[PDB]
Every structure is written in C-alpha cells, then in structure tokens.
Design a protein around this ligand. Structure first.
Ligand SMILES: CCC[C@@H](C)[C@H](N)P(=O)(O)O
Ligand SMILES: [Co+2]
Ligand SMILES: [Co+2]
Ligand SMILES: [K+]
Length: 304
C-alpha cells in the first residue's frame, strides 16, 4: 500500500478491551463480523422514524452521556499522549456511565472510539502513535444505552498549530453550525450539503463525498442519509421528531478519499489535512435541539 501522507499505523494494538457483561450490548457486539442484523433489515429503506416521547428521553440521555465522554477525551489532548491512551480512558468512561462503546466491534472496528489525525478524514483507529505538537485530531464518540445510540465528534489542536490548521478547524465548525441553523420542519435533507459546500468553497476548502450524516436512534446508522456536498440526491424532508447527525468533513486539498488496508481509516488521497465536527440533532416544531451540545460552555474545545 502507498500511504497518502506522513501518518502510519503504529501496531500492535493492546488486546481488545472487555466490556463487563452488566452493560447492555447492541446486536453486533457479539456478531463474529460485527454485522448489525437490525441495521441490515432496514438497509436500503427511505422511511424515517418518528420518535416517540420515550424515544426522545432515551436519545437525550445517551447523547448527554456521549458528550460527557467526549469532554473526558478533550482534556487529554496534548503532545506525547497516544490515541490508544485516549481510547482507554474513553472506554472506561463509557463503562462508568453504564454505556457500551458503540464503535467496539461495529463491523469489527477494534476500538472504542475513532481518532483521526491530520490527513485522516474519519474512522481512525486508536494506536501507539504519540500525538505531535502541531497535529489536529478528531475524537468521535458514540455510546449505547438502553437501546439508543448517541454520536458526536470534535477536532482538537495538539499544542500550537499553524494558521492553516486554525482556519480549517474554524471553517469546519462554521460549516456544521450553518447547516444546523437551517434545520427545521419542511427543509429537505439535501439542502444541508448546499449550505456546507458554499461555506467550505468560499474558504478554499473541499468537501468529502464518501461519508454522510445519518439517522440514529435504536440503529447507529439508518435513514436518512445526509451528504455534506452540494447538489446531492438525498431523499426526504425534515419533520418534527426526526433524529439525525450532521458531520461534515472538510479538506485543505481535494475531496477524494481512500481507505487504509485496515478497512476503516479514511484518508485524503492527496495527504493534506481534514477536519470534522458532528452533532446528533432532534427536529422540533421550531427548529432543532442539539442533543450532544456542550452544557458547561457555549463553545467547542478548540475555541478555549
Ligand atoms: C466505527 C464507526 C464509528 C462511526 C459510527 C462514527 N461515530 P460516524 O457515524 O462515522 O460518525
Ligand atoms: Co460519529
Ligand atoms: Co455519525
Ligand atoms: K483529521
């Protein structure tokens, strides 16, 4: 394999971390290939669940717990700390909140969160590489509690970073918040990508095409599919009671991605940096509720 940039995987990984049997497990947890029967059954379906009131309480709960776990990870970001150390902490923090770490064994993903450094777009595997001053790193947290998944992510600076990194991370966050601002009943899911790409393009960045935002509730990834790029073909109209993510990935260079031999790590084909933010959203009668919002600050961690 020809790597696209400077980053390399740092193996071996520590043995897979056990989740005590008292934690309730999603279906794929114990599938040999990590397939989710429940996801697949609804795979290809266009129909969007309307959450009930107990569904909404369940989503509120797991999304706030996910946020707490992301906040634990945010506090560990500094030069010299390995992404595997961050995942260890994340794994324990999930267990402490009586949650299963959703990524763990999801289609055989081997860790409890995704860590995506520099040219890694998304789904990076926590490993033995120490974070380097200058890096940008995304941590993506997904928790499962009482049948519901909650999903968020932020990009972080590792010590001092350069102007290009400041600008890419800020712009990515602005892309996300502009899209969120547009969310309310009657808006087409396909419109969000027009908004995201307009802002990215204005700032000289490109928009990843192969990964999308998604419905989420009892299933981690379900209808709707939500592209982040302009003139997409996404199907569906927003309605009060829909829950879904928006998680744009924006890049310094070109939009094209490819996958490492690990089957998960998505990287820019050109080796230039990519940043991402993600919230889980509930559409309400007036707009939407950011279920994974940071409660104890107005702002994401990079703005500290
Ligand atoms: C290993 C899968 C991790 C997934 C589910 C991420 N949380 P996302 O849905 O790509 O944001
Ligand atoms: Co995520
Ligand atoms: Co997601
Ligand atoms: K990245």
């Amino acid at each position: 394999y020809r790597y696209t940039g400077k980053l390399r995987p740092h193996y071996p990984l520590m043995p897979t971390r056990p989740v005590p049997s008292y934690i309730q497990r999603p279906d794929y947890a114990d599938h040999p290939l990590g397939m989710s029967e429940s996801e697949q059954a609804l795979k290809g379906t266009s129909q969007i669940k309307l959450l009930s009131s107990e569904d909404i309480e369940g989503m509120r709960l797991v999304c706030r717990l996910a946020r707490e776990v992301l906040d634990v990870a945010a506090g560990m970001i500094k030069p010299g700390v390995t992404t595997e150390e961050i995942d260890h902490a994340v794994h324990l923090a999930c267990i402490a909140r009586n949650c299963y770490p959703s990524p763990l064994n999801y289609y055989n993903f081997p860790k409890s969160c995704c860590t995506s450094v520099n040219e890694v777009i998304c789904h990076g595997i926590p490993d033995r590489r120490p974070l380097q001053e200058g890096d940008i790193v995304n941590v993506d947290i997904t928790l499962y509690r009482n049948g519901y998944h909650g999903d968020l992510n932020e990009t972080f600076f590792v010590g001092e970073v350069d102007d290009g990194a400041r600008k890419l991370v800020q712009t990515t966050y602005e892309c996300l918040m502009q899209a969120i601002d547009a969310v309310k009943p009657g808006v087409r899911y396909r419109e969000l990508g027009n908004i995201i790409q307009k802002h990215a393009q204005a700032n000289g960045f490109s928009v990843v095409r192969s990964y999308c935002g998604h419905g989420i509730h009892k299933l981690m990834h379900t209808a709707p599919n939500v592209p982040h790029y302009a003139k997409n073909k996404a199907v569906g109209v927003m309605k009060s009671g829909h829950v879904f993510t928006i998680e744009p990935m924006i890049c310094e260079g070109g939009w094209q991605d490819e996958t490492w031999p690990d089957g998960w790590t998505a990287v820019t084909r050109d080796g230039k940096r990519s940043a991402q933010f993600e919230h889980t959203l509930l559409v309400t009668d007036t707009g939407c509720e950011i279920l994974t919002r940071r409660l104890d600050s107005a702002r994401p961690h990079f703005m500290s």
